[PDB]
Design a protein around this nucleic acid. Sequence first.
RNA 1: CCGGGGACGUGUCCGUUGAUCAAGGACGAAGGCCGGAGGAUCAAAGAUGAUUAGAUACCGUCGUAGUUCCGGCAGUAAACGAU
RNA 2: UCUCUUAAGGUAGCCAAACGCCUCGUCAUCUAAUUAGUGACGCGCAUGAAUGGAGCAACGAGAUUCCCACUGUCCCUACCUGCUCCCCAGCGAACCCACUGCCAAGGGAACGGGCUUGGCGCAGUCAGCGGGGAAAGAAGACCCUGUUGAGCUUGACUCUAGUGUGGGGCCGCGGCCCCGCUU
RNA 3: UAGCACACUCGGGCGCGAGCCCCGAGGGCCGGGAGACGGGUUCUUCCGCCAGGCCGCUCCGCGGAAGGUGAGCCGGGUCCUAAGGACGCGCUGGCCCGCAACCGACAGGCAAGCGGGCACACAUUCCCGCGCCGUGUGCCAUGCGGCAACGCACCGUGCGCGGCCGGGCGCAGGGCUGGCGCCGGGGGCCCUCCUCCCCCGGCGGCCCGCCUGCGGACUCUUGCAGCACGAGGCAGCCCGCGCCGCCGCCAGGACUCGCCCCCCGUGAAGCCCCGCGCACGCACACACACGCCCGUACCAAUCCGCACCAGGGCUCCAGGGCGCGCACCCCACGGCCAGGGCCCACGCAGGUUUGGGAAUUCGGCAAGCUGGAUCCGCAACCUCGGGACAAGGAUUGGCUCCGGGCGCCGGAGCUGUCGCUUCCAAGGGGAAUCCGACUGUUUAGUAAAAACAUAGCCUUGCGCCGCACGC
RNA 4: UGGGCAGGGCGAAGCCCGCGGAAACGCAGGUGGAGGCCCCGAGCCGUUCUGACGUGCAAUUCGAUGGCGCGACCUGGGCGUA
Lengths: 100, 246, 81, 52
Amino acid sequence: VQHLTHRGRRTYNNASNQKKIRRTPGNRRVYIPKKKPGRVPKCVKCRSKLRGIDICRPAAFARLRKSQRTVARTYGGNLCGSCLENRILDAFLSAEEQLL
Amino acid sequence: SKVIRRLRLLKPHHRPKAMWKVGETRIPVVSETMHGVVSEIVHERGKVAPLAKIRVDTGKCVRRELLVAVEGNYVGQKVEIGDSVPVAVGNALKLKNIPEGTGVCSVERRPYDGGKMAKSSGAYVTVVGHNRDTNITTVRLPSGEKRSVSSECRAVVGVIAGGGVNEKPLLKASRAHYRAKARGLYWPTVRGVAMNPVDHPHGGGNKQHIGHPSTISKHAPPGQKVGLVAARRTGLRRGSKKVLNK
Amino acid sequence: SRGTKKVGIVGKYGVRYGSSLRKRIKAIEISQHAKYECKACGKTSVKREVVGIWKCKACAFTFAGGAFAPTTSAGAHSNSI
Amino acid sequence: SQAKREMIERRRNPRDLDQKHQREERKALIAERVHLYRNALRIPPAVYQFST
RNA sequence: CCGGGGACGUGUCCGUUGAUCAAGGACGAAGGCCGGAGGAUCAAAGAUGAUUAGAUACCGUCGUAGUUCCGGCAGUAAACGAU
RNA sequence: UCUCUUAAGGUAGCCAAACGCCUCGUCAUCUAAUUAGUGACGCGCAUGAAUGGAGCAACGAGAUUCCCACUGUCCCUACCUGCUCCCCAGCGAACCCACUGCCAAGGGAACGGGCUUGGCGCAGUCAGCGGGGAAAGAAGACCCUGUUGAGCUUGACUCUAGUGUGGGGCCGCGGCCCCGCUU
RNA sequence: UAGCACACUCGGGCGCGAGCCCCGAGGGCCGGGAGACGGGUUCUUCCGCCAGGCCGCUCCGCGGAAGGUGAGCCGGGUCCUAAGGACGCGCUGGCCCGCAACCGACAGGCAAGCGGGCACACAUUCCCGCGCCGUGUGCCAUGCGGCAACGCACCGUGCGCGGCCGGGCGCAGGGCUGGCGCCGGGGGCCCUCCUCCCCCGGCGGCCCGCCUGCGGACUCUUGCAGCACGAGGCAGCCCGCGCCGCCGCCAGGACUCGCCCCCCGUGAAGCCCCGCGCACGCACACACACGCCCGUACCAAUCCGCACCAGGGCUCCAGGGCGCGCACCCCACGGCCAGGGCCCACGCAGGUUUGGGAAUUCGGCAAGCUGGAUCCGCAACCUCGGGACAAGGAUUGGCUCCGGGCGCCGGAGCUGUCGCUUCCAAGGGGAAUCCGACUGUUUAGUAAAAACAUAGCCUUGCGCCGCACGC
RNA sequence: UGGGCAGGGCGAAGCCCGCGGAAACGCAGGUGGAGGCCCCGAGCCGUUCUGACGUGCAAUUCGAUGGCGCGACCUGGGCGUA
Ligand SMILES: [Mg+2]
Ligand SMILES: [Mg+2]
Ligand SMILES: [Mg+2]
Ligand SMILES: [Mg+2]
Ligand SMILES: [Mg+2]
Ligand SMILES: [Mg+2]
Ligand SMILES: [Mg+2]
Ligand SMILES: [Mg+2]
Ligand SMILES: [Mg+2]
Ligand SMILES: [Mg+2]
Ligand SMILES: [Mg+2]
Ligand SMILES: [Mg+2]
Ligand SMILES: [Mg+2]
Ligand SMILES: [Mg+2]
Ligand SMILES: [Mg+2]
Ligand SMILES: [Mg+2]
Ligand SMILES: [Mg+2]
Ligand SMILES: [Mg+2]
Ligand SMILES: [Mg+2]
Ligand SMILES: [Mg+2]
Ligand SMILES: [Mg+2]
Ligand SMILES: [Mg+2]
Ligand SMILES: [Mg+2]
Ligand SMILES: [Mg+2]
Ligand SMILES: [Mg+2]
Ligand SMILES: [Mg+2]
Ligand SMILES: [Mg+2]
Ligand SMILES: [Mg+2]
Ligand SMILES: [Mg+2]
Ligand SMILES: [Mg+2]
Ligand SMILES: [Mg+2]
Ligand SMILES: [Mg+2]
Ligand SMILES: [Mg+2]
Ligand SMILES: [Mg+2]
Ligand SMILES: [Mg+2]
Ligand SMILES: [Mg+2]
Ligand SMILES: [Mg+2]
Ligand SMILES: [Mg+2]
Ligand SMILES: [Mg+2]
Ligand SMILES: [Mg+2]
Ligand SMILES: [Mg+2]
Ligand SMILES: [Mg+2]
Ligand SMILES: [Mg+2]
Ligand SMILES: [Mg+2]
Ligand SMILES: [Mg+2]
Ligand SMILES: [Mg+2]
Ligand SMILES: [Mg+2]
Ligand SMILES: [Mg+2]
Ligand SMILES: [Zn+2]
Ligand SMILES: [Zn+2]
C-alpha cells in the first residue's frame, strides 16, 4: 500500500498531532490533520451530559451561533433541568420556612 | 569522607514540589460564624488524608476555604466555622467551646494559626480538660503526648479521614515505590552498613557490621548523627509506657 | 467452580509474600473493593475512588471516610455522638 | 503564602515593606511607630520640657 | 435501649406437627495463638535474696509473656451430679 | 556431687555446613573404584539466635551432586561446503630495530649470537611454524627502600565546623529571684 | 609485506581509456519513505577530472561555474503557563534566603488549507480550483416557539461563579486495509491450458445513547448489574457515531465513547475561550479593507564516534501467503548489487561421522536430545495459591466425504516406500543439597552473584515538621 | 512535559445455572479476566561460548547462546543537583 508520511510535519503521537487518512483521487492515501475531539458539556452539579449544546473544539465552539452554544432556559449550559428544578425548589422552600 | 546522605537530603532541592499541594489547609479566621458548604472532597498527591474544599457564600463574595477532610464529611454538608458553633462533626470552633473527651483534628498550636496538629490520616486529638481560669486546654495528641494549648485555638471536630491506612501491608516493592514517589521520600534506602566508609559512619569492611555503638549523642556533629540519635533505651520494648519511660 | 478453597481474593497474589501477609491483606481487599449501601439514596453502590474518599456511583453522593472501609471505629464514634 | 501575607498585614512592621515603591508607605509607618514608642518611654525632663 | 427466656394462668390458635440421633452445624472456662489497642495489680519464663546436704522448688523481692479490651483462631478441663 | 571463676557462662536450635585446624574426621549411602554428593554423628580449632537462629513451598543465566535421555566431549578420527589462506592486477601500512651465520662444552655477572676450544653451515629464495632470541608490549602492580604520597580508620598528635554551657553587651515600664506589662 | 571490493552475469553505449559510469537483458538481495536533533549547500543542473574515493572511473556526497528554499492557514515569535530561572530590592562583610518584575515548551495548552497543476530541483508557501481564520472600519435591531426534553432570533462589553486531563483486559464502534464475488474502464502476456497478469472505481430520514412527555413495574449486559430518587413500552427531544436519498459480502485495523478494573500512585498549570448569574451598553451578520518577523533546498555514505567506521542516535508509515502471531520463511511495493585465478596446510563458520556413549573434562564446556498443537495422564511436597507443560503416553500429511453449535470443531474412508509441528518455528527431564524468600538492581570496559534493593519485622528521635496512620 | 512497548498461556474475585443439603453451605459446568503470574515479538540487556576479533569493523565491536520484554521499565525535550 502507499505508506503514509506526515508530510513535512511532526510525527509525534500527541493529542494535538492526531492524523486521519484521506483517500486522494489517485488511489493514494495521505494523512490530514485530525483535530482534537471537542469536550462534551456537563452539568456543573451532577456532571451528566447536557443536551442541546453542540460538541466542538473550544475555538470552533466559539465560532458557532449563540443559539447553538446554550439552552434557552436559565442556568442553560451550567445545570441540567433536574438540577435546576431542584435549585428552584431549594431556594423557594428555604425561603418559605424561613418566614415561619 | 563524602557527605552522608542524611545531610545531603537536607538541601532544599530535595523537598517535595509545591505544585503537588492543592492549597494551604487553614481553618479560617472569622469574626462571626461562617457558614460553608463542602464543595468537594479531593485527593492531594502524597497525602493519604483527603482535603475538604469548603465554599462559603455571603452577600459580598465567595470565599473558597480548604480543610483536611474529616471522616464523615460529605459533599454538600453545611459546615460552620466560628467561635461557638455547634459541636457537630465537620465544624471548626475554639477549644473552650468544645466539650471534654471529644476527638478533634486540625488543632491549632497557637491561636488563629490555621491548624497544626492531627492533620494526617486517622489522627485525632482528645480534648482532656479545660482550665477555665488561665484559658488553657490540655489535649491528648496522637503520639500520646498530653499537650497544653490555649482555649482560643481552633480545631475541627472529628477524626481525620483516610482512616486506617497502616493496616494494609505493602505487599510489593512497587507499592512502596509509588507511595514514596508521591510523597517525595528518599526510597529505596540502602543500609549504611552495606556502604563504604566514605559514604557512611556505618560503612564498614569485610563483614557487614556497625562496629561502634549506634546510639549517638544528641550533641553530636551532623554527619555523626546517624542511627539512633538520642536513644534513651534500645532493644525490644516488652512493657507498658509507664515502665519504659522511667 | 470455586477456583480456590481458602485464599479467595488473594489468589491473585499467587504463592508470593507469605501466607500470613496474604491472610492479613485479604480482609482489607475484601473491604476496600466492596460496594456499600449509600446512606443518601439507599442503594448498594458506594465504591472507593481514592484512599479516604467514598462515592456512591448511583446518586453521586461522595463522602470522606476511612482508608479501606467507609467507616473506621474512631470515625464512627465521633459521628455517633 | 496567604496566611503570611495576612500576618505581615496584622503586624505593621516597616521592615516588611522592603520594595522600592513601598518607600513612601514605609516611612509613614516608621513615623507612627516611632511616635508610639517615643511617648511610651519615660521622657526625661530635658526633652519633655518642650512639650509644655 | 435492643433482644431473649422459662414457669404459671386461660373455653386463645394449630392438630400430631413428635422423641432420639450417624453425617453436618453452632456455642464452648482457663491457658494458648494471630492482628490491633492498652498495661494498675498479679505473674509463667527469667533474674535475684534466702532455705537446704543439694533446691533448677516451696519463702522474700523484682519481672516478661500473659492477665484487660476489640476482631478472629483454637476447641480442651476433675467441661463432674465423675450419673 | 564438690570446687575455682565471670557482667553472663552458648539457651532453643543447627553442623566437618559457603562456618572443623586436625581432616581425605567417623558411620551409612551413592561407585568396579569417590579427597566429591547426600544422610547421620558432634568436647563445635573458631556454630547459634533481627551482628538474627532454624526453615526450601515458589522463584533463580546463582553454587553443587546423582540419574534418565542425549550426543565428535572422548575412543579416534574422517569427509564435505563457504570464507580465509595461497597466486595475481592495482592500492599499500605498523610493531620493532646496538650490531647480528648456526651449535656443543667451558669460562664468565654463577643459563652466550659474538669470548675460548671444538662441531658445522653459507646463491642469501617460497610456504609453514612457534624451540630460542632469558622476543615485543609497560621506568614491576608483588616485595623492600624513601624521613615521597593519597584513600580510609581510630584509644595517634595538634586543631576545628557543629551541638551545648557560663558570664557580659543587647538603653522599656511596673509591682513582690519571682510575677505582671508593652513600647 | 600485513592488509584493501571478492552475487553477480551477458550485450550495447558515450569515451584516449571501462569489472565498477550509463542503457537493455538475465540472476539475486533488502528495507524504503517522511519529521526532530545534528550537518550546512552535501540539494539540482551544466562542465570537468590524469587530484581525492582502501582498486579503476567517462562516475561521485569530489573540483569548477551556476541555480534553488516564496506561507494570514506549516513551525516558532508578536500568546499562555509547567517544573524551574531570575541581572531589582530587602537581608548581608559576603552568600544563602525573603519578595520577585521578567522569563521558561520548535512534542504542553493552542485561530484557520485541502485537492490538483507546474517544475531541473523546490511549493499544503507559486499556480488553479474550492475554502477558511483573524483584524480594522462602516451600517443597528431592542425578540419568539414547544407541556417538556429544547428549538431559534449568524450581536457586544465588564464582573462574579464555574468549565480540561491516568492506565489496563474486554464489548461495541472505527480513519483505513485486505480478501472474495459481480460489474466497469485502462495496459500487457499467452505450444497446450487458462474470462492470464498489472493498474484504476453539506442536505433530509433512520440508528445509537442521554433526556422529556404519557404511564407505573419491570429489565439487562460478553461481563458487576439496573429500577418508585421511576422499569419495559409508546411518542418525542438532544447530540455524536453510523447507514440510506439528494455495487454487495466477509475479515483485520491505528484510534475512540461508556461500562468495568487498578492504585497507601487518583493521573498539570495558566492564558484564551465558553456557559450562566448580575450589570453595563449597544455591531454578529453584511459590506469594504487588510494579514508582521523568523525558519522553509537536502541528508538510511551528508549526524556523532579523527573516516564513505560492521558502533551509536528521538518519532511516523508494512501489502500477499503460512501461522496464534506487525515471530520465522517466501512474495509484492520501493530500493539495491564495488577485483582476477586457484581452492595446500592451519584456521573462522557450517553439515555429516559406523560401533561405543561422558570413558573427555576442574566441570557435559561445547554440541546434542526435547520442542507447536490436540487428547490422555500427572507424584512427593506445599505458605493450599502452587508444584505442573511435573513425570509420562498417543496423535499429527495429502485427498474424498459426512456431521455440527460452521473464521471453527468432531468423525469416517481412501492414499504414500511409515511419513506428516515434513521447511521454518519450537521446553530436555528427574532425585537432592547450599544460598538468596520472590519480581527487581549492580561493578559502562575482566565479577549479575549468595552482593544490593524489597515487603515484612524492629529500634530511635521529634508536638518549633510535610504535623505522629507523620517526617 | 511528551512518547514507546507482538502474540499466546495460566485462569483470582465476582456472577449465572445445575446437582446435593434441614441448615450452614458444598461440589460441578460456564462466565469473568485478576496478577511486580508464564512462554515470548519488536526492542532492551549482557549468562555462557571464557566463540570471533584482539596494530580490530570497533580506544568494548561482532556472532551464537541466554535473560528481560506494560515495568521498581525504557525514552525525547525542558529543569534541578558541581
Ligand atoms: Mg523539506
Ligand atoms: Mg443546540
Ligand atoms: Mg560494598
Ligand atoms: Mg567516617
Ligand atoms: Mg562497618
Ligand atoms: Mg549481615
Ligand atoms: Mg566513632
Ligand atoms: Mg478463652
Ligand atoms: Mg487469653
Ligand atoms: Mg496480642
Ligand atoms: Mg511483684
Ligand atoms: Mg547446644
Ligand atoms: Mg565423601
Ligand atoms: Mg562424580
Ligand atoms: Mg539476642
Ligand atoms: Mg554468625
Ligand atoms: Mg531475577
Ligand atoms: Mg598482489
Ligand atoms: Mg651453546
Ligand atoms: Mg668460535
Ligand atoms: Mg620464512
Ligand atoms: Mg619463540
Ligand atoms: Mg621500577
Ligand atoms: Mg632515612
Ligand atoms: Mg598481500
Ligand atoms: Mg557483497
Ligand atoms: Mg529524508
Ligand atoms: Mg548530487
Ligand atoms: Mg581521477
Ligand atoms: Mg539586561
Ligand atoms: Mg506548540
Ligand atoms: Mg492560498
Ligand atoms: Mg523532496
Ligand atoms: Mg424508558
Ligand atoms: Mg504479513
Ligand atoms: Mg558416533
Ligand atoms: Mg563426567
Ligand atoms: Mg581423566
Ligand atoms: Mg571422569
Ligand atoms: Mg550448554
Ligand atoms: Mg510432557
Ligand atoms: Mg518438581
Ligand atoms: Mg535473588
Ligand atoms: Mg563489569
Ligand atoms: Mg522474617
Ligand atoms: Mg513476568
Ligand atoms: Mg523468558
Ligand atoms: Mg546494566
Ligand atoms: Zn444536573
Ligand atoms: Zn447513593
